[PDB]
Design a binder for this molecule. Sequence first.
Ligand code: FAD
Ligand code: SOR
Ligand code: CL
Length: 415
Amino acid sequence: DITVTNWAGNITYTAKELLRPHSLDALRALVADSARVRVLGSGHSFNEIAEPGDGGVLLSLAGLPSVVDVDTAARTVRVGGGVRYAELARVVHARGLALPNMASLPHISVAGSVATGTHGSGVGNGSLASVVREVELVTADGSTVVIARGDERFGGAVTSLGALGVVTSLTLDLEPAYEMEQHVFTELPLAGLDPATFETVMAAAYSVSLFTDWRAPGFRQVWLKRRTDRPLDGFPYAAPAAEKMHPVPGMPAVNCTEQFGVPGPWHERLPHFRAEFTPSSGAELQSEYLMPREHALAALHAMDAIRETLAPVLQTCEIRTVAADAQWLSPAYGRDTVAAHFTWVEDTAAVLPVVRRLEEALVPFAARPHWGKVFTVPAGELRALYPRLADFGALAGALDPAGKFTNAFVRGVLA
Ligand SMILES: *Cc1cc2c(cc1C)nc1c(=O)[nH]c(=O)nc-1n2C[C@H](O)[C@H](O)[C@H](O)COP(=O)(O)OP(=O)(O)OC[C@H]1O[C@@H](n2cnc3c(N)ncnc32)[C@H](O)[C@@H]1O
Ligand SMILES: OC[C@@H](O)[C@@H](O)[C@H](O)[C@@H](O)CO
Ligand SMILES: [Cl-]
C-alpha cells in the first residue's frame, strides 16, 4: 500500500497503488480491463477531480516516453500527455518556435492543464487548450480515437475533465520564437480605476496580471510581460518596482522570473516562476472565478467591500484576462473573460466559509469556477453557466457509454 496525494497534499486519493504502464500495449489492456479509471497528471488540482472512487484505477503516463516531436515546416509539435510544459517549452524553443502563452508555473502536465481550462493572461491570448489542433484518446474499450480541429465533436475533446478517455498525445500549433521583458509596478489604486483606465491597464502589455492582499485599499503589484517586437507606452498608473518582487508578499523573490525589463526568451518570461524552482508540494489552496470581462470592475468592487473577510485566509489574489474559448467546458467559453484567482492559506476549515461568501458576492456576474481549483458552487447552478454542457454530455455518452471515465466529480457536473 502506498498513499497517493495531490501536489498540495490536501487531497488523499483512495487508490493504494498508482498504475504506471510502460507501453501503449499495456495501457490499452489496462484501460480495457478496468471498470473505472481516472488519470493522474502532475496533481496540481485542489479538489477530487482525479479521484476514481473506491475500487477505481488511478493511472499515470509517467512510465511512458515523454515525446516531444516538432514539425518545423508545419509549425506543430506532437507531445505526450504526461510531458510537462517546462520540457515542452525548452524543446520547441531550441527548434526556433514558441507557444503563445504559459501558466504561472511550468512544472505541470500538458494534458492535465488543458483538461480543466488552464490559462495565463492577456486580452488577445486564448487558454492553453486553444493551441491544440488534435487529441489522441485511448477510449473505454482500449481502442484509439483521434479528434481534430474541424470535427463537430472537437469543441468537447480538449477541455474534457478527462471524461472521454486517456489522452496519450496532443498536437499543438506554434509560432516563431520571440523575446520578452517583464516590468513590475507597485500600488495601483482601485479608487479612480474606471472602465477606460482598467481596459488600458489590462491591455498595456501582451500579458498583464494585478496582485493584491485585499488589506490596504487597491492593488499591491502590477506585472507587465511585454513582447520586444511590440510597442511599450509609459505606464503612469503605478510606481516602478525598486526591488525584485514575489506575487505573495514575504515569499522568496529569487524563485521568480527575471524583472526590471531585462529581455529574455518567451518561456523564461511568461511563467512567474523560474524553471529552477521545483517545489514537490505547496502549503496553499487555490480558487479562481472566470467572468465576462465587462463585469471586471463590478466584481473587483464586490471583493473590496468584503475584503476584511478575504484577507485573513489569503496569501495573494491575481487578476488576469483570457480571450474567448471554443472549448464547451472552458470557464472562458464563448466570451472574453476576466479571471480572479485566490491563493489561500492551507486551512480548509477556515477557507471554505470564505469561499462561500465570495461565491455569493459573485453570483450576479455569471462566475464560472476553475475546474481544477476549490469551489462550492452547486451542480445545478454550474450546469446553467455552460450553454454547451449538453453537447458535452452527449459526446461523453457516445465515446464512453458505461461512464468508465466518469467519477463522482464529473457525475455531479453532468447530472
Ligand atoms: C499547483 C498549481 C496549479 C496551477 C498553477 C500553479 C500551481 C503551482 N498555475 C495556474 C495558472 O497560472 N493558470 C491556471 O489556469 N491554472 C493554474 N494552476 C492549476 C492547474 O494548471 C490545473 O489545476 C491543472 O488541471 C492541473 O493539471 P495536473 O496534471 O497537475 O492535475 P491532475 O489533478 O493530475 O489532473 C487534472 C485533470 O486532468 C486529467 N488528466 C491528466 N492527465 C490526463 C490524460 N493524459 N488524459 C486524460 N485526462 C488527464 C485528470 O484526470 C484530472 O481530471
Ligand atoms: O492560477 C494560479 C496562480 O497563477 C498562482 O500560481 C499565483 O500566481 C501564485 O500563488 C502567486 O504566488
Ligand atoms: Cl484604492
